[PDB]
Amino acid sequence: NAAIEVEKNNKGINLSFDIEFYPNSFQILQKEYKKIDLIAKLLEKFKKNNILIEGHTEQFGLEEEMHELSEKRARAIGNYLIKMKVKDKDQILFKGWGSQKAKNRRVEITILN
């Protein structure tokens, strides 16, 4: 669960992992920042690349509500990467899938070609 799963696709290099969020929130648990720090170490080395951050929910709530929550989760991750100075806001696309694709929730980050 501490590991990032890395796989190539047609879009770039996919980083798939799971981040504990507090229930029904886009707030990252304190202990998870070290995992994002590892992600930051990889992204730092792909200096010129743009990234895509994709968020997800699990609950079958109203679609706009789930979309918003899932996007705010992607943004919480992106914001930390901004703060760590590994990417600029210029370089980050944020996508929420809602629920369409225990606190652990799926996040993907793609290092875009």
Next chain:
Amino acid sequence: NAAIEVEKNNKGINLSFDIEFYPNSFQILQKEYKKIDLIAKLLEKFKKNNILIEGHTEQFGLEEEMHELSEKRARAIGNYLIKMKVKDKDQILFKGWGSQKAKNRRVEITILN
């Protein structure tokens, strides 16, 4: 099974994955080179780092025989990385664990601090 698992430790950034070798051999199946190419894409970006490649066997054979086989598996991976020009021989440590730690066998590569 196509994914590399990435996790940080005290030694550096650990890349754990599994490579199909032909039974009792250190020959990599043709289809696996694309996976090593992905590893190469990551290593390319950690230009200054030395790496450690660790090989493993599963059979409970004679310890020196298993050690040799496991080390030759690490070397097969390293040799391809040399050939792809992502690392020089100067930068690669090779370690065989034999069996002490379906064709799929465990390999680890650590991007050393």
